[PDB]
Design a protein around this nucleic acid. Sequence first.
RNA 1: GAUAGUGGCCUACCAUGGUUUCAACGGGUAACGGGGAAUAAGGGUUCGAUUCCGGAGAGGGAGCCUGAGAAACGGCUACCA
RNA 2: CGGUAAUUCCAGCUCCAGUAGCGUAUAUUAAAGUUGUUGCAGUUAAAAAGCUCGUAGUUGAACUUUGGGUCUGGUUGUCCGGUCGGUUUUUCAACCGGAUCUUUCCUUCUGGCUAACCUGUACUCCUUGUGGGUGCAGGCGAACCAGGACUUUUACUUUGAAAAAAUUAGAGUGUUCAAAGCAGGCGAAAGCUCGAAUAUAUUAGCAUGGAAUAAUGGAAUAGGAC
RNA 3: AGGGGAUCGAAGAUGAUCAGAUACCGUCGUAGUCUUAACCAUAAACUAUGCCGACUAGGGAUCGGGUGGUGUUUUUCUUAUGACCCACUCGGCACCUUACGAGAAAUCAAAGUCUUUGGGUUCUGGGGGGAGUAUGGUCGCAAGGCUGAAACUUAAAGGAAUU
RNA 4: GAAUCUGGUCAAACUUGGUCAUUUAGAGGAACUAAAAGUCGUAACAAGGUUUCCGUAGGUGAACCUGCGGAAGGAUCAUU
Lengths: 129, 150, 144, 87, 155
Amino acid sequence: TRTSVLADALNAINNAEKTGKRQVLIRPSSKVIIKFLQVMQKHGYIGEFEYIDDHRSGKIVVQLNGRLNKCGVISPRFNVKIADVEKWTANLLPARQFGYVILTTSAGIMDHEEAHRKHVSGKILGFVY
Amino acid sequence: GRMHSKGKGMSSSAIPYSRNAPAWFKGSSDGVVEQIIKYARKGLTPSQIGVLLRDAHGVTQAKVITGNKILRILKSNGLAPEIPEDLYFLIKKAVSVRKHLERNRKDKDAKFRLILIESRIHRLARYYRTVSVLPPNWKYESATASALVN
Amino acid sequence: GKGKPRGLNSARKLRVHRRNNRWAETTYKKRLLGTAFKSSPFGGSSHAKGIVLEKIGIESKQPNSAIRKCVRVQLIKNGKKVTAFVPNDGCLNFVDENDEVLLAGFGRKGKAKGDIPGVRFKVVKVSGVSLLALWKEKKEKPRS
Amino acid sequence: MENDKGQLVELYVPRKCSATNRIIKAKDHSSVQINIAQVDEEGRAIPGEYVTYALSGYIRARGEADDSLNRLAQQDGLLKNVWSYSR
Amino acid sequence: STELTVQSERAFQKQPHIFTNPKAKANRKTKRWYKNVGLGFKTPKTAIEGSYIDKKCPFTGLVSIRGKILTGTVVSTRMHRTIVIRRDYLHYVPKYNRYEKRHKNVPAHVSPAFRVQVGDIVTVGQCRPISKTVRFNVLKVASATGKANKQFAKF
RNA sequence: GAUAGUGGCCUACCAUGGUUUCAACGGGUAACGGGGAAUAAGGGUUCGAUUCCGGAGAGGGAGCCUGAGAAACGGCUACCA
RNA sequence: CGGUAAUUCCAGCUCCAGUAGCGUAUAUUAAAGUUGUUGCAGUUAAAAAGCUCGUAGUUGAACUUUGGGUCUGGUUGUCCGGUCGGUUUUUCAACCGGAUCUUUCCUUCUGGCUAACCUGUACUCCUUGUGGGUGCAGGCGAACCAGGACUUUUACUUUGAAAAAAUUAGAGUGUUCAAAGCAGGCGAAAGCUCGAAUAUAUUAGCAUGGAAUAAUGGAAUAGGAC
RNA sequence: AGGGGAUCGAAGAUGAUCAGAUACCGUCGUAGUCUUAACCAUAAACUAUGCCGACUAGGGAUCGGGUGGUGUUUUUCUUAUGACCCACUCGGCACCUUACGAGAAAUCAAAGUCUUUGGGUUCUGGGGGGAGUAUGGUCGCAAGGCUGAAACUUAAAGGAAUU
RNA sequence: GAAUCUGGUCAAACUUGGUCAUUUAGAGGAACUAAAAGUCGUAACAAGGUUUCCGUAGGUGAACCUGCGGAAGGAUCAUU
Ligand SMILES: [Mg+2]
Ligand SMILES: [Mg+2]
Ligand SMILES: [Mg+2]
Ligand SMILES: [Mg+2]
Ligand SMILES: [Mg+2]
Ligand SMILES: [Mg+2]
Ligand SMILES: [Mg+2]
Ligand SMILES: [Mg+2]
Ligand SMILES: [Mg+2]
Ligand SMILES: [Mg+2]
Ligand SMILES: [Mg+2]
Ligand SMILES: [Mg+2]
Ligand SMILES: [Mg+2]
Ligand SMILES: [Mg+2]
Ligand SMILES: [Mg+2]
Ligand SMILES: [Mg+2]
Ligand SMILES: [Mg+2]
Ligand SMILES: [Mg+2]
Ligand SMILES: [Mg+2]
Ligand SMILES: [Mg+2]
């Protein structure tokens, strides 16, 4: 079973970045994955990326900038409570400063800074530092 | 990765990118439907019907040509079996295995395989119960299974 | 992912697993079973008074050699016959026979100390004067 | 990076590899500067002016380095035909 | 639930302080007293059209719904005029930051204003302590059929 | 029926439920429960007889009288210690 | 360490630590990522069930409105200070929010109430006039009532309310300082003053906004919708 | 509990050898070794590597299937098949190099993608002895198995390498 | 309306038997450690002088040996 799909997407990407591939192929590829990728793009971590409309499930081809370091998805989607956010960022990100915790909220899949600004948080998906 | 062995096969039928009809391959839809119904009348079971359509006639997948599935079509015309095709086949297999076991008292491997078959049947039974195709609190096993087959 | 369901509605399994695991840790087990009250001479107390039954020089463990000037002590509260070591330069010249004697642990969370075999406790307050005090003559013995 | 009111800190601003954008480290006793000469008609190899690359140790170590260099060349117009997008 | 009989006890039962005058002419004969329970519930017609008495009913009795109103699936119908709802919820252990599928069974008295079958969700209400354990009255068996008129597969 | 009042609270009669591996019931507790205490990243562990809030209990079991309010113990009534 | 030069014993001497304290014993927390949710190990250091099935449990592909513009308010800096260290618009953006049409409705109407114009009945006080509206007959509802109908249901999450005090963190304040306490402080030294702040304590409820995430369900003998 | 009882062979004999040998070696030899009914559930039951799933690095081999070859070859004319051959390709059982990753190391394409810690899940471990013991459950016709302590007790017991 | 008395009723208690647990007696029985200048062998570590081990059954001063089947943690990563 490919239980979680976001996880799978990120893992392959991570591997690619580690080797120094400039491109990855992600097998199943959801709404969620696409949204995550968009978020990453918005802060310039990922290059262009192309979702193949398979007349089936999906397929994503990514272009890597080499600006990625580690993209992690956290295992259960812990429901997270606006103050919890701070704790998570302290744990998950290499500085009080930069990089992003990519939490899904009611307002959409944002990073963490955006969520804080918007003043809304929810479950966590990933992170990008 | 295979429901019962340690084997991890990936032999599988693929599908074409086009949901649209394959252009030149003529006939119609009505004709296809008629053919399907004829096959149903003759006693063939869904998969078999599909196979027959594909090879001899100008068929790729009934979904592409007619619009609706094979099973759906059957249901519409009211010719579909009472116990779902796969499940029925499983039951038949189980019956066969049971028969074998009756004859051969010492055949441990066969018994083991029978157990697996039974488990599979149970799974299938459960899912049919959930989607309501087998009327609830109907269990399929050893004594009544034979009766059910034919 | 290794063991533990990194699940989310997983929690009961986790909690139960932890409970089950804990028992292998010694301290926790001791706390829970209540080894302190059923066994280990003292009532899980720091100090216990006992009575100097008989002075025994216990012959020490290996590399080291000597005789270790301990006391078989019968505790009052439980009635258990321990062997409590006595510190410094004799000081059995203070202990005598059939005296009330306050004992301590040794520093080893029960168990054995250094090189003295089958010994668990120091003596501190003999008859109610404390051994150190007697030895360094900062306070002195109540006659008899 | 910058100390508030301008004023750049953080010295030794890392070379990044041209192939991978992966930082060329301080003791990259594996990495290289590749220098390729800007060139002109009849003799002429124009001293002083090069098109330059840096290749980080890691790619080279992996083995796939030549192809990366080719790619770099084809982009900066130091080659044509040699290396294609599709393989 | 009750199911038929109407007037079969050692005693003979009626709604209290509600009385049918033999003197006056009425084709309806018996005057039923009902109660609009409130709280946005439509009081089932199968009480007003009904014939049973039943003292622990929220509509045709002195029991009145206050305080908590909960929902949940019916596990057990196996005893007379009452039901066992199983209110299942997720309780949180912080040490792991995660959850438990927790059980708990609410016994609720059921007015025969309802046909309640195993597996049906029930908006149940709190009330005056009915008996021993039962402190709730079934108010809305919201699942009306759940595929009962359309069970057959054939066209 | 009882009660201040609801209720298996008890009685009559009828039915056969209810709880449970999403730990029932047992057995333990060197368990009064919180508020809290110590512990100095984050999560936490232990500890809470004790200054506040509840709850029991007045040697143990009972039983009651008076009174708005006690099943009171610096109030009785036994019985056992 | 100690078997005749003991840096560990017993003494003296200097010395070191802490100091009106300091040591010993037993717990216990930290150290203990040696109990591991964060966060441990399992080929060989202990540890992967002999193997498979299987019920609970946990976990579960992807998919259902994504987009663009239009207009309208906030908050930071930019650029000057227009000013006797602060002040607000234009030049400017990012930033959240709202209203919209787009092929897109917000649960729906019985009547209150229409508030203003989709309005025009006379037209003009009046800068040669869309500068400006007192005004009553057809008719915008959201500017919210009360009254029905019937709301797929949750988990989330924000805001809110209650989470007794003390304790904890924390605002002020010269208990001589400090722990503290809740006071105090200021005049002509011929009565006036601030004060006793806030904030957590997530958990089970309760109210509200959000609709991604994760469920759950509707129309397939349509006894389906209007 | 029956049969069948060739060979080998726990026990036993019995010969040496040895200070000694009901041990190693020699020669007989029941039980057993086959097998039908039943049981027992253990093994270094070992790949000492839980099962699923995804991805990252090449390489030939080899087994199973499957296409692509005016390919060789069998000739009974063209042949059509088989057996090879070459290129693939799934699936497997492994193996060889590299480590760019691991790991304590030995080593490992998994023991990788883990302090840059989070795919899903079972189960098991918590210094060594005591001890897989005692007791209690149980399941066994018994032998036994599954579960399984503590008291004590000790600063090591271990691994993997090096001299 | 006093003692008193019939019926309940709550019922302390008391005589009985049987479960349990903390405990201390425990006639005797086998264990285990700590002590490691006893006694006998030398079992294991070298192919440890029969390679060791596992599971099992039998035997016996004692380590143990021997069947049968497995391992290598072997002393073999090797035959056109
Ligand atoms: Mg407590
Ligand atoms: Mg308390
Ligand atoms: Mg106490
Ligand atoms: Mg007393
Ligand atoms: Mg009193
Ligand atoms: Mg009393
Ligand atoms: Mg000297
Ligand atoms: Mg820590
Ligand atoms: Mg460890
Ligand atoms: Mg081991
Ligand atoms: Mg304070
Ligand atoms: Mg002999
Ligand atoms: Mg012999
Ligand atoms: Mg085993
Ligand atoms: Mg094993
Ligand atoms: Mg242990
Ligand atoms: Mg040899
Ligand atoms: Mg030997
Ligand atoms: Mg040997
Ligand atoms: Mg070993």
